[PDB]
C-alpha cells in the first residue's frame, strides 16, 4: 500500500529501455510531438515566411526558412519525428525543390488522423485510405497541368521557373535575384539545337562565392571560377590579349622523388660539385618545353618548390594552387583541358583557352578572374554574391541552389509542366478528392475525405503569414471553385490563388499574369514522400527507446 509493485518482471530488459504503444494515448502524444516542430515551419512557409536562427554546439549560426536545412542542426529525440526529419532531407537531395511542402503536408496528415483514430478507425484502414487517395491525387496533377517550357533556353521563359522558386527564399527584390541565376544557367547549357543530342545538366556546375561587403545590386555573373589566391612571382593583367594557352597539372611541380628512401648519394667531391648545378638544369629542361608551347599559365594541384617557381617567373608564366580535388576538377571544364601527371610538354590538343586573367580587390583580398568571353564558351560559371552579413550569404547560396535544381527538372521529364502556383494546386485537389470520396462505397471514405482536408493548410498558411484573417479570405476563395464549370469551355477560374497583403479579398486576378507557377515534377515526389512519412508513423503500433 505504501509502494507500488513497480511493474513486476520488468527486469527482462535494461532499465533504460522504455515501451510506448499506440494505446494509452501515445499515438496521440506522437502526433502532438509533431505539432511542436510543425508550427516552427508554418511561419517559414511562403514568400512572407520567417527565417529561423539555430545555434549548434560549435557556435555556427545558420539563418534559413528551409525545413530541410533547419532540421539538420537540431537534435531530435522522439523517434517518429526523425521519420519526418529524414523525409524532408530526401526531398532536398532528389528534386532540390518543395522542401517546406513535405514538412507541412506530412504533419497535417497526422493532425487529421487524430480525429480518424478517435472515431475508431484501425491503423490498417487509415493507411489504405491515404494510399487510394494518393493514387487518385497523382493522376489529377497530370490533368491540371497548363503550359510548357518548350525550348531549353530563353530570356523570358527562365523568369517563369527560377523566379517563383527563389521568391520564397530571401524574397527581397524580384528581378535582381532572378537575373543573376538565369544568366549562369545559359552558359552551362550545350545548346546545339537541331542536332538531336541528349541534353545534359549538372547541379554542381554553378558555384556561389560568398564575399562580404558591398550590396546585392553590385553582384554580377562570372563565366569563370573565382578563388582567393595570391600570385607568387608577379601579378599580370595580360593586356597583350590574343587570348592564352593554359595547362593544368594535377601533380606538383618539382623534381621527381623516389617513393622509398630518397637520399643524395655522393661518392667523391667530383659528383658534389655538379650536384648543385644538376638540379637547376632538370627544371630548366622540363619548363623550357612548356614555355615553347606558348603556355602562359600553369595550374598546380599541390605545393610547388622554389626551384621550380624560379624558371616560371623567367618566361612570365602564372602559377595557380588548386588544393584537394573538386576545386581542380572544375577548372578544366572551363578551358576544356585534360590533366596529365607528367611534367613533360603537354599535348597541344589538351591545352585550354582563357583570354584574360585578372586580379582585383573585391572584398579586400586578391581574387583571380577566370571569366570567359562571348567566343570559346565555358562551363561551370560562378556567381559573385555580395552582402553585408555572412548569415544572409549562406541562405542565398542555398536559394540559388534551389534555382539550379529547378533547371535539372527541365531535363529528365518531357518538359517543364508548369502548375498553378499561389496554392492553387492543393486547393483544386480538394474538390476532386471530395468527389472521389463519394464514389467509393464503404468505410474507407472517411480517410479519403479527410485526406483532402489536409490540403487546406497551404491556403491557410499563406493567408496567416500575410497578415490576413483565414476566416474571411479562405471561404471567399471557394466561391470560384463552387461554381464548377459552365456550359461553355475556356474556364480561367483555375488560376485563382492566395494573395499576400495588398488589398486582400482573394486578388492577383488570374495568376497567369503574375507568371508565378509550380513544377509538376516537384509536386509528384513532394506528395509521395509526405504521405509515406505520415504512413510510417501511423503504421507503428509500438515504439521502443533505449537509454532514455
Amino acid at each position: 500500500s505504501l509502494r507500488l509493485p513497480q511493474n513486476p518482471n520488468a527486469g527482462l530488459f535494461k532499465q533504460g529501455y522504455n515501451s510506448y504503444s499506440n494505446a494509452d494515448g501515445q499515438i496521440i502524444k506522437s502526433i502532438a510531438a509533431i505539432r511542436e516542430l510543425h508550427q516552427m515551419c508554418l511561419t517559414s512557409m511562403g514568400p512572407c515566411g520567417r527565417n529561423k536562427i539555430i545555434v549548434n554546439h560549435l557556435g555556427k549560426i545558420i539563418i534559413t526558412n528551409d525545413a530541410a536545412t533547419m532540421l539538420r542542426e537540431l537534435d531530435i529525440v522522439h523517434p517518429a519525428v526523425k521519420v519526418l526529419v529524414m523525409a524532408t532531407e530526401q526531398q532536398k537531395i532528389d528534386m532540390g525543390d518543395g522542401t517546406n511542402l513535405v514538412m507541412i503536408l506530412a504533419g497535417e496528415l497526422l493532425n487529421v488522423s487524430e480525429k480518424l483514430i478517435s472515431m475508431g478507425l484501425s491503423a490498417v484502414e487509415i493507411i489504405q485510405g491515404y494510399n487510394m487517395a494518393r493514387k487518385f491525387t497523382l493522376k489529377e496533377l497530370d490533368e491540371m497541368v497548363v503550359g510548357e517550357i518548350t525550348d531549353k533556353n530563353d530570356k523570358n521563359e527562365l523568369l517563369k521557373m527560377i523566379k517563383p522558386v527563389i521568391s520564397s527564399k530571401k524574397y527581397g527584390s524580384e528581378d535582381i535575384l532572378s537575373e543573376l541565376v538565369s544568366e549562369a544557367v545559359s552558359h552551362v547549357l550545350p545548346v546545339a539545337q537541331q542536332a538531336g543530342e541528349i541534353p545534359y545538366f549538372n547541379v554542381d556546375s554553378i558555384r556561389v562565392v560568398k564575399i562580404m561587403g558591398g550590396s546585392l545590386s553590385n553582384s554580377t555573373v562570372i563565366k569563370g571560377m573565382v578563388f582567393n589566391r595570391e600570385p607568387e612571382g608577379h601579378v599580370k593583367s595580360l593586356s597583350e590579349d590574343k587570348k592564352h594557352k593554359v595547362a593544368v597539372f594535377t601533380c606538383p611541380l618539382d623534381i621527381a622523388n623516389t617513393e622509398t628512401k630518397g637520399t643524395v648519394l655522393l661518392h667523391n667531391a667530383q659528383e658534389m660539385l655538379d650536384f648543385s648545378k644538376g638540379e637547376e638544369k632538370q627544371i630548366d629542361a622540363m619548363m623550357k618545353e612548356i614555355a615553347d608551347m606558348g603556355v602562359e599559365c600553369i595550374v598546380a594541384g599541390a605545393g610547388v618548390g622554389e626551384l621550380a617557381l624560379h624558371y616560371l617567373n623567367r618566361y612570365g608564366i602564372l602559377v595557380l594552387k588548386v588544393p584537394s580535388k573538386f576545386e581542380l576538377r572544375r577548372l578544366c571544364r572551363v578551358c576544356g583541358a585534360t590533366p596529365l601527371p607528367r611534367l613533360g610538354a603537354p599535348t597541344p590538343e589538351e591545352l585550354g583557352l582563357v583570354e584574360t586573367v585578372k586580379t582585383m580587390e573585391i572584398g579586400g583580398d586578391r581574387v583571380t578572374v577566370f571569366k570567359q568571353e562571348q567566343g570559346e564558351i565555358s562551363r561551370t560559371s560562378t556567381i559573385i554574391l555580395r552582402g553585408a552579413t555572412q548569415n544572409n550569404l549562406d541562405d542565398i547560396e542555398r536559394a540559388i541552389d534551389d534555382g539550379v535544381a529547378a533547371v535539372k527538372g527541365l531535363m529528365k521529364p518531357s518538359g517543364g509542366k508548369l502548375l498553378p502556383g499561389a496554392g492553387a494546386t492543393e486547393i483544386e485537389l480538394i474538390s476532386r478528392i471530395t468527389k472521389y470520396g463519394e464514389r467509393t462505397p464503404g468505410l474507407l471514405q472517411l480517410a479519403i475525405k479527410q485526406f483532402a482536408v489536409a490540403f487546406e493548410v497551404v491556403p491557410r498558411t499563406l493567408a496567416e503569414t500575410a497578415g490576413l484573417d483565414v476566416n474571411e479570405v479562405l471561404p471567399n476563395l471557394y466561391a470560384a471553385h463552387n461554381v464548377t464549370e459552365p456550359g461553355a469551355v475556356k474556364t480561367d477560374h483555375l488560376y485563382k490563388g492566395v494573395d499576400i497583403d495588398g488589398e486582400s479579398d482573394e486578388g492577383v486576378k488570374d495568376i497567369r499574369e503574375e507568371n508565378i507557377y509550380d513544377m509538376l515534377a516537384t509536386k509528384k515526389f513532394a506528395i509521395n514522400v509526405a504521405t509515406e512519412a505520415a504512413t510510417t508513423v501511423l503504421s507503428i503500433d509500438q515504439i521502443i527507446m533505449a537509454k532514455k
Binding site: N9, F13, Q282
Partner: protein
Amino acid sequence: SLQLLNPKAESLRRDAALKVNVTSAEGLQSVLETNLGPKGTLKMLVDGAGNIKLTKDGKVLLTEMQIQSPTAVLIARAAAAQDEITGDGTTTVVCLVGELLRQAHRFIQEGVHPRIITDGFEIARKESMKFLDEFKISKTNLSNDREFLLQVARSSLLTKVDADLTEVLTPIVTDAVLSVYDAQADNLDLHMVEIMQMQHLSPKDTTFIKGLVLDHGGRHPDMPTRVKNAYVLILNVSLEYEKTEVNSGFFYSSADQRDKLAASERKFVDAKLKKIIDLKNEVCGMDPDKGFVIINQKGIDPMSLDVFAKHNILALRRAKRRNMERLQLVTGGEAQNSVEDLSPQILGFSGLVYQETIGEEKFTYVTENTDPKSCTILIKGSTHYALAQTKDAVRDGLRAVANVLKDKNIIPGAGAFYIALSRYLRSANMNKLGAKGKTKTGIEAFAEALLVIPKTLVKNSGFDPLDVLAMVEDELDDAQDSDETRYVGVDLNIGDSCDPTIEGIWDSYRVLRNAITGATGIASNLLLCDELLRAGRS
C-alpha cells in the same frame, strides 16, 4: 547453504526458481505476441547512438535490446539460431517455449514431477514427425510452375510489409530463385542473391536486375559510361604502391640519375599494362561498337588510370571479394590472377553496360547476358531504416523459397499444422504411445500449447480467438466421414476459416521441423532446472 560458501551470492531454487522460467518467458512472449501474424504490430528501435531499426522481425528485437534475465537468453539464442539455418521461425519458437512452460506449470503446482512432464514432450513430438510425413504434400520440380513459387513467397512478404510492397517484391524474389534452379539441382543462396542498399526515389520503386551491380564507377571522365558490348576481364592483382619490403630505396649519384631512377616505379606498372594491350589486340575487331572493361578487386593507382582512358577502357577498383566469384556466373568468363597468360576464352560477355551517377557515389550496372548464371536484387529505400526493413523482409523470403526447391515437399500454413496436431494427440490411444500414467498428462500440455499460435493470429485481428476456432473444430468433424481430405486454415480478414491450398498460404518444411525440435529442448531444460544462482570471480 550458499551463504557459507560465498560471502555475497544470490540464488533462487525450487518454487523461487520455478517462477523464473515461467514469468521471464511470459514477458518475452508478450513482446512478440503482437508481432506474430501479417496484421501484427510494427516496432521501432532507437538506441543511444541515434540509429533507427524499424522491422517486424523478432531477431532484431533480441539482438539490439539487451536482456538481463538469463532465462530469455536461452530463448534468444534459440530464436536467433532458428533464423540462421531456416531463415524463419524466430517468433514461432519464442511463442512455443514461453507457452509450453506455462501449460506445464499448472501441473507442476498440482504436484507432478517435472521429469515425467518433459518425458511426455518427447513422446508427443515424435508423433508430430510421424504425422509430418502424411501431412506434407509432395511437389514435383519437373513442372516448373511459376504460380507455385509466387504464393509461397507471399507468405513471408505479407507478414513483414503490406500488399503494396508485396506485389512489387513478389516477382523480384521469384525471378531471383528462378536462376538458382539448375540441372545440377544445387542451390547456393549467398552467391545467387544479394542485398544492395541504395537510397533512390521511393521504396516501392524497387526493380529486378538480371546482372551484377557494383558500388564503383569510372574515375576518369573520358571513360565510356555506356558500352554496348564489353568484355569483362577479371584481375585480382593490384597496380599501386606496394609494401616495398621495409623500404630499402634508391641512391642516385647525380641529378640526372635521380629522375632516371624515378622512372623505374612505372617499369613494373607498365609491364602488366602491355599484357592488357596485347589482349585487346585480339578483340580489336569492331572496336567502336564493342568495348573492353576491367574490374579489379583492389584499388588501382590513379597514375595508371590515364592509360585506360586513352583506350576507352572502364576500370573498377576496390571491389568486394565476393563480387569476384560472381563475375564467372554473370558474364560467363573465368578469373585471371597473373597477366602473363591471357586468352580470349576467359573474357566475359555483356549485352548492356551502363553507369548511373546519383550524388557523389557512382554505380555500375551490367545486364542483358546470353545465359546468365546469377542475378541481383537492387534494394531502394527512402530512409536508412527503410533499407533495413526491406533487407530483413527480402532475406527472410529467400530462405523460405530456397528451402522449397531443396526438398520435394511443402507444408501448408495458416495454422493448419498446429490444429491438426491437437486432434491427433488428444484422440490417439495411449497404449500405442510409450507414455503411461502421469506421463499421459505431459502430452496434453504439449497439444494445448500448439493452439495458442492460431489464437495469437486472431488476437491481432481483434476477433475473439475462442469463437473463431469453434467453427474450425466443427468442420474437421464432418470432413472425416464425408470422404474428403481438406486442410482448414484461419482467415483473419473475415474472421472465418479458409483453405491454405486454395488461398496460397504455404510454410517451409525445414522451419517447422527445426522449430518444434528446438523449442522442445529449450522448455525441457528449463522445467528440469530447479535452481538458479550467480557466482564468479570479477
